[PDB]
C-alpha cells in the first residue's frame, strides 16, 4: 500500500504463472519447428525440371521400377535414369512436344538433366539399397506409394530413430521378397508371426549389431 496498487498482489502471482507458460510455450515452438514438414521438407512435392510423372509411367504405361533404377538391387545407389532410357520411348512418342524439350536438348548435347533430390542424406549416413531390398524390404515401407505420385514427395523425414525403429524391430516391416513389384501389397494381419519367421529364415541379425554406429556412420 506504500508504492503499489491493490491489484498488484494478483498481478504478480499471475505474472509468475504467465512467465512459466511462456517458457513452456518457447520450448514447444522450438521442438515443433525442428520436426515440422516444412523444415524436413516432408509431403512437399518438389518441382522437377522436366515434370516427370511416376503415376503416368507406372500406373498407366506400366513400366517396371528396375527398368529405370537398374542398380537398386546390386549397389548402395539406385540408378537415376539416363537420357538414353527416356529417348528409347520419346524418340517416337510425343516427339516435337514442349514438355520433352529439355530431354531432347540433352542426348544431342552431353549436358545432363539437373533433377532435384527429394530423399536427401547428410553424407555421413551411407545408405545401401541392395542389402535392404535383398532382405525383404519394399519401397512402399520407405518411399510410399510412388506408383501413384504425379510429383514425388518425401513420405517422411529420414530421422535416425526412423532407421532405429526398423533395425531394432524388423519383424513389423519385413516382407516375403515381393518388394520390387506389389506396391499394392500390404502387411498381412499376422505380420508378427510371418515377420519372426522371415527374420529367422533370412538371417536378419539381432538389434545388437544393427544398432552399432559404424553400420551407418563412417
Amino acid at each position: 500500500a506504500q508504492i503499489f496498487p491493490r491489484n498488484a498482489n494478483l498481478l504478480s502471482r499471475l505474472s509468475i504463472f504467465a512467465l512459466v507458460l511462456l517458457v513452456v510455450e518457447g520450448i514447444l515452438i522450438l521442438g515443433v519447428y525442428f520436426r515440422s514438414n516444412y523444415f524436413r521438407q516432408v509431403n512437399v512435392a518438389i518441382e522437377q525440371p522436366v515434370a516427370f510423372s511416376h503415376q503416368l509411367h507406372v500406373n498407366v504405361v506400366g513400366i517396371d521400377c528396375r527398368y529405370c533404377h537398374t542398380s537398386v538391387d546390386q549397389s548402395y545407389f539406385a540408378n537415376i535414369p539416363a537420357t538414353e532410357t527416356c529417348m528409347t520411348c520419346h524418340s517416337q512418342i510425343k516427339t516435337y512436344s514442349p514438355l520433352l524439350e529439355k530431354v531432347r536438348e540433352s542426348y544431342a548435347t552431353g549436358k545432363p538433366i539437373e533433377w532435384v533430390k527429394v530423399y536427401d542424406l547428410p553424407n555421413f549416413v551411407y545408405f545401401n539399397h541392395s542389402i535392404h531390398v535383398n532382405k525383404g524390404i519394399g519401397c512402399s515401407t520407405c518411399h510410399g506409394q510412388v506408383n501413384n505420385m504425379p510429383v514425388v514427395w518425401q513420405q517422411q523425414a529420414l530421422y535416425m530413430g526412423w532407421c532405429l525403429n526398423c533395425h531394432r524391430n524388423p519383424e513389423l516391416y519385413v516382407r516375403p521378397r515381393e518388394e520390387v513389384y506389389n506396391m499394392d501389397y500390404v502387411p498381412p494381419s499376422n505380420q508378427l508371426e510371418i515377420g519372426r519367421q522371415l527374420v529367422a529364415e533370412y538371417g536378419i541379425m539381432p538389434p545388437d549389431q544393427l544398432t552399432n554406429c559404424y553400420v551407418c556412420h563412417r
Binding site: 513452456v24 520436426r35 523425414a157
Partner: peptide, 27 residues
C-alpha cells in the same frame, strides 16, 4: 486458494500432454 492449486495442477498436466505429444507421438 484451493481453486488456484487446482488451476496450477490442470496447467501442469495440460503442458505434459502437450510436450509428450511433441516428443513422442508426433514425428
Amino acid at each position: 486458494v484451493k481453486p488456484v492449486f487446482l488451476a496450477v495442477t490442470l496447467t501442469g498436466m495440460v503442458a505434459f500432454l502437450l510436450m509428450v505429444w511433441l516428443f513422442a507421438f508426433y514425428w
